[PDB]
């Protein structure tokens, strides 16, 4: 039971840590979106960063 409680505590810690990794309301670690594209060129071309849900 003690080991089970330790496991549960660590899992809840993981969830808390993962859900709070937001900057400006968007994140690449929660799984809310599939990718984020930033500006890469003066003509509108994009730099794509795929989302890595952790």
């Amino acid at each position: 039971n003690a080991l089970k409680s330790d496991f549960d505590s660590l899992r809840d810690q993981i969830e808390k840590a993962a859900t709070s990794a937001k900057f400006n309301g968007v994140s690449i670690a929660d799984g809310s979106t599939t990718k984020l594209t930033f500006l890469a060129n003066s003509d509108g071309s994009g730099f794509t960063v795929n989302a890595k849900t952790i």
């Binding site: 968007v26 500006l39 994009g46």
Partner: protein, 55 residues
């Protein structure tokens, strides 16, 4: 000499044309500056990672 007096009349029309085109050129310079700024704003707004508040 009548023709020389007529040329004296022509010079005024040419000067008025100068003034009109100068006004147009000043406005055009301002407009080109504004168009550059508009292009920058439109480029910035095309980013897909922006909030609803920055758009």
């Amino acid at each position: 000499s009548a023709t020389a007096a007529s040329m004296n009349a022509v010079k005024d029309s040419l000067q008025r044309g100068q003034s009109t085109i100068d006004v147009a050129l000043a406005a055009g310079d301002t407009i080109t500056d504004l168009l550059g700024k508009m292009k920058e704003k439109a480029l910035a707004a095309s980013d897909c990672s922006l909030n609803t508040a920055s758009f």
